[PDB]
Structure formats: structure tokens, C-alpha cells
Write an enzyme that holds these catalytic residues in place. Structure first.
Site, PDB file in Angstrom:
ATOM      1  N   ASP B  25      40.686  33.355  27.924  1.00 26.60           N
ATOM      2  CA  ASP B  25      40.684  33.692  26.578  1.00 26.60           C
ATOM      3  C   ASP B  25      41.625  34.816  26.314  1.00 26.60           C
ATOM      4  O   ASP B  25      41.522  35.912  26.565  1.00 26.60           O
ATOM      5  CB  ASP B  25      39.304  34.211  26.368  1.00 26.60           C
ATOM      6  CG  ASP B  25      38.877  34.413  25.176  1.00 26.60           C
ATOM      7  OD1 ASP B  25      39.957  34.484  24.237  1.00 26.60           O
ATOM      8  OD2 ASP B  25      37.717  34.935  24.692  1.00 26.60           O
ATOM      9  N   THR B  26      42.927  34.108  25.772  1.00 31.96           N
ATOM     10  CA  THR B  26      43.977  35.177  25.595  1.00 31.96           C
ATOM     11  C   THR B  26      43.754  35.893  24.417  1.00 31.96           C
ATOM     12  O   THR B  26      44.584  36.851  24.187  1.00 31.96           O
ATOM     13  CB  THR B  26      45.178  34.064  25.382  1.00 31.96           C
ATOM     14  OG1 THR B  26      45.160  33.217  24.163  1.00 31.96           O
ATOM     15  CG2 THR B  26      45.742  33.375  26.617  1.00 31.96           C
ATOM     16  N   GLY B  27      42.690  35.584  23.413  1.00 33.87           N
ATOM     17  CA  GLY B  27      42.220  36.405  22.441  1.00 33.87           C
ATOM     18  C   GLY B  27      41.294  37.461  23.076  1.00 33.87           C
ATOM     19  O   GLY B  27      41.073  38.260  21.896  1.00 33.87           O
TER      20      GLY B  27
HETATM   21  C1  LIG Z   1      39.675  44.993  13.859  1.00 36.47           C
HETATM   22  C2  LIG Z   1      39.180  44.567  15.167  1.00 36.47           C
HETATM   23  O1  LIG Z   1      37.668  44.266  14.990  1.00 36.47           O
HETATM   24  P1  LIG Z   1      37.100  44.195  16.422  1.00 36.47           P
HETATM   25  O2  LIG Z   1      37.359  44.985  17.208  1.00 36.47           O
HETATM   26  C3  LIG Z   1      36.941  42.376  17.051  1.00 36.47           C
HETATM   27  O3  LIG Z   1      38.196  41.664  16.621  1.00 36.47           O
HETATM   28  C4  LIG Z   1      38.023  40.392  17.457  1.00 36.47           C
HETATM   29  C5  LIG Z   1      37.125  39.513  17.415  1.00 36.47           C
HETATM   30  C6  LIG Z   1      37.330  38.000  17.996  1.00 36.47           C
HETATM   31  C7  LIG Z   1      38.531  37.984  18.985  1.00 36.47           C
HETATM   32  C8  LIG Z   1      38.567  36.485  19.499  1.00 36.47           C
HETATM   33  C9  LIG Z   1      37.739  36.409  20.459  1.00 36.47           C
HETATM   34  N1  LIG Z   1      37.880  37.559  21.499  1.00 36.47           N
HETATM   35  C10 LIG Z   1      36.811  38.490  21.934  1.00 36.47           C
HETATM   36  O4  LIG Z   1      35.909  38.360  21.296  1.00 36.47           O
HETATM   37  O5  LIG Z   1      37.149  39.401  22.552  1.00 36.47           O
HETATM   38  C11 LIG Z   1      36.245  40.645  23.190  1.00 36.47           C
HETATM   39  C12 LIG Z   1      36.274  40.701  24.173  1.00 36.47           C
HETATM   40  O6  LIG Z   1      37.560  41.465  24.539  1.00 36.47           O
HETATM   41  C13 LIG Z   1      37.854  42.254  23.236  1.00 36.47           C
HETATM   42  O7  LIG Z   1      39.185  42.141  22.561  1.00 36.47           O
HETATM   43  C14 LIG Z   1      39.132  41.462  21.459  1.00 36.47           C
HETATM   44  C15 LIG Z   1      37.449  41.749  21.232  1.00 36.47           C
HETATM   45  C16 LIG Z   1      36.776  41.934  22.583  1.00 36.47           C
HETATM   46  C17 LIG Z   1      37.888  35.179  21.315  1.00 36.47           C
HETATM   47  O8  LIG Z   1      39.091  35.250  21.924  1.00 36.47           O
HETATM   48  C18 LIG Z   1      37.607  33.834  20.735  1.00 36.47           C
HETATM   49  N2  LIG Z   1      35.997  33.864  20.294  1.00 36.47           N
HETATM   50  C19 LIG Z   1      35.185  32.882  21.091  1.00 36.47           C
HETATM   51  C20 LIG Z   1      34.866  33.285  22.473  1.00 36.47           C
HETATM   52  C21 LIG Z   1      34.034  34.561  22.643  1.00 36.47           C
HETATM   53  C22 LIG Z   1      34.238  32.229  23.079  1.00 36.47           C
HETATM   54  S1  LIG Z   1      35.391  34.190  18.911  1.00 36.47           S
HETATM   55  O9  LIG Z   1      36.404  35.156  17.936  1.00 36.47           O
HETATM   56  O10 LIG Z   1      34.141  34.690  18.815  1.00 36.47           O
HETATM   57  C23 LIG Z   1      35.390  32.473  17.964  1.00 36.47           C
HETATM   58  C24 LIG Z   1      33.977  31.848  17.875  1.00 36.47           C
HETATM   59  C25 LIG Z   1      34.311  30.360  17.035  1.00 36.47           C
HETATM   60  C26 LIG Z   1      35.412  29.743  16.639  1.00 36.47           C
HETATM   61  C27 LIG Z   1      35.254  28.441  15.937  1.00 36.47           C
HETATM   62  C28 LIG Z   1      36.185  28.215  14.624  1.00 36.47           C
HETATM   63  O11 LIG Z   1      35.997  27.557  16.885  1.00 36.47           O
HETATM   64  C29 LIG Z   1      36.794  30.552  16.742  1.00 36.47           C
HETATM   65  C30 LIG Z   1      36.791  31.803  17.440  1.00 36.47           C
HETATM   66  C31 LIG Z   1      39.561  39.120  18.940  1.00 36.47           C
HETATM   67  C32 LIG Z   1      39.415  40.308  18.404  1.00 36.47           C
HETATM   68  O12 LIG Z   1      35.352  44.434  16.098  1.00 36.47           O
HETATM   69  C33 LIG Z   1      34.418  43.636  15.144  1.00 36.47           C
HETATM   70  C34 LIG Z   1      33.441  44.423  14.825  1.00 36.47           C
END
Ligand SMILES: CCOP(=O)(COc1ccc(C[C@H](NC(=O)O[C@H]2CO[C@H]3OCC[C@H]32)[C@H](O)CN(CC(C)C)S(=O)(=O)c2ccc([C@@H](C)O)cc2)cc1)OCC
Lengths: 99, 99
Positions: B25-27
Site C-alpha cells: 500500500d504505497t498510500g
Molecule cells: C490530511 C490527512 O488526513 P489523515 O491523516 C488521513 O489521510 C489519508 C487517508 C487515506 C490514504 C490512502 C490509504 N492509506 C491509509 O489509510 O494509511 C494509514 C495507514 O498509514 C497512515 O498514512 C496515511 C494514513 C495512515 C490507503 O492507501 C488506501 N485505502 C484503502 C486501504 C486502507 C485498503 S483508502 O484510502 O481508505 C480507500 C478506500 C476505498 C477506495 C475505493 C474508491 O476503491 C479507495 C481508497 C492516505 C492518507 O486523517 C483523516 C482523519
């Protein structure tokens, strides 16, 4: 190019005539972008991840340019905290993971 | 290996002596695994995702083997919807994005 993962893989995209910064996210099935008033029809959708679900608007056949690589697919628009380029578009620009 | 993104980049991991499936998960900045038992001490932590924040247990300096590549780093354990391997460990196994 090659993008290391020391820092967030943020890149410039062009969508709906606007430039934005977005995350290349292999963990995302589909693409989710910050609130923007795109033209055309849309349908409501719910997408979930860590922390629960959010309400988004699904637009189909939207053209996005990602680092000069064009792609066309579904884009979800809503109160996402970050712009997320998901696999539906990453595949179109030939993106792979390598180790 | 080179991993395309037409399917979810799921791989087998070994942690605490048990095999599991996890998403590259590069995100994700950090690595978050579903509820499980791990030995050693841990500290409470908060992490935020697309839907909000969750409570997790932070395990530091944990041995984890990802697709045959060893890493030792921080593993968060909590109510994530799926096991995700974040950049903190992807960097350790030499993972990059390429297109
Ligand atoms: C200003 C910043 O606000 P925040 O800090 C959070 O920002 C964020 C939020 C989300 C992400 C991207 C997600 N990463 C993430 O959850 O990472 C966690 C863990 O490591 C930390 O790093 C970053 C956060 C921490 C992940 O890659 C992708 N996901 C699915 C995975 C979980 C299976 S998904 O997004 O849920 C998603 C669900 C459904 C769909 C449909 C369309 O297909 C498309 C995408 C990166 C930064 O606080 C907010 C209250």
C-alpha cells in the site's frame, strides 16, 4: 520514471482543467479526489477505509493526466483528506511495484 | 519481483511466526494489521484514514517477512479493514513505483 517511497509518492495531476497534487496509491482500488465541481452526471457512492466510510460522487470516463501519462476512468469526488490515484488509473499509465 | 496493478497487490507475510495476507500500500505511511496476538510490549496510538481515526497497538522493531524479504520495523495492530504494508516497511524491502 522511478519513485522511491522514502516520502509520500505525490505527483501533479491534471483533471477538469485543473492541476492538483495526488498520491499514487497501490492500496486503492479506485481514485478519490478532493471536492471539485465537475460537469456531467454522477451517482452517489459510499467508500470505506480506516476510520469508516465517506460519501462521494462517482463520475465515469473522466480524463486525468498523471505525470504526463493520460488515463480515463472512474473518479470519486468527496471530502477525502488527500487526492488518491488508485489502481483503476495506475494500470493505465503502466505503473508497477518493483523490489 | 515486478507486480502489476490489475489486481490488488496482495502478498503473503510472516509475522510472529504466522502467515498472513497483506496489501502492498504505497498510500500508507505506516503498516497496519488486523487484530492479532503479538508478543512483547506495545503502546497505544491513533492513526487516521479516509474515514477517520482508530485506536491501534504500536509494536516497534517487529520482525516481518514480506514476499520473501525481511524487514524489522513498526507494526500497528487494530481494526483496519485489511492488512496493509505501508512505506515504513516497503522502503526496507527496496520497493519502488515505476512507470
Ligand atoms: C490530511 C490527512 O488526513 P489523515 O491523516 C488521513 O489521510 C489519508 C487517508 C487515506 C490514504 C490512502 C490509504 N492509506 C491509509 O489509510 O494509511 C494509514 C495507514 O498509514 C497512515 O498514512 C496515511 C494514513 C495512515 C490507503 O492507501 C488506501 N485505502 C484503502 C486501504 C486502507 C485498503 S483508502 O484510502 O481508505 C480507500 C478506500 C476505498 C477506495 C475505493 C474508491 O476503491 C479507495 C481508497 C492516505 C492518507 O486523517 C483523516 C482523519
Amino acid at each position: 520514471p522511478q519513485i522511491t517511497l522514502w516520502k509520500r509518492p505525490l505527483v501533479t495531476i491534471k483533471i477538469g482543467g485543473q492541476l492538483k497534487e495526488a498520491l499514487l496509491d497501490t492500496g486503492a482500488d479506485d481514485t478519490v479526489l478532493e471536492e471539485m465541481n465537475l460537469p456531467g452526471r454522477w451517482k452517489p457512492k459510499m467508500i470505506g477505509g480506516i476510520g469508516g466510510f465517506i460519501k462521494v460522487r462517482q463520475y465515469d470516463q473522466i480524463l486525468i493526466e498523471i505525470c504526463g501519462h493520460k488515463a480515463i476512468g472512474t473518479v470519486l469526488v468527496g471530502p477525502t483528506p488527500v487526492n488518491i490515484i488508485g489502481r483503476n488509473l495506475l494500470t493505465q499509465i503502466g505503473c508497477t511495484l518493483n523490489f
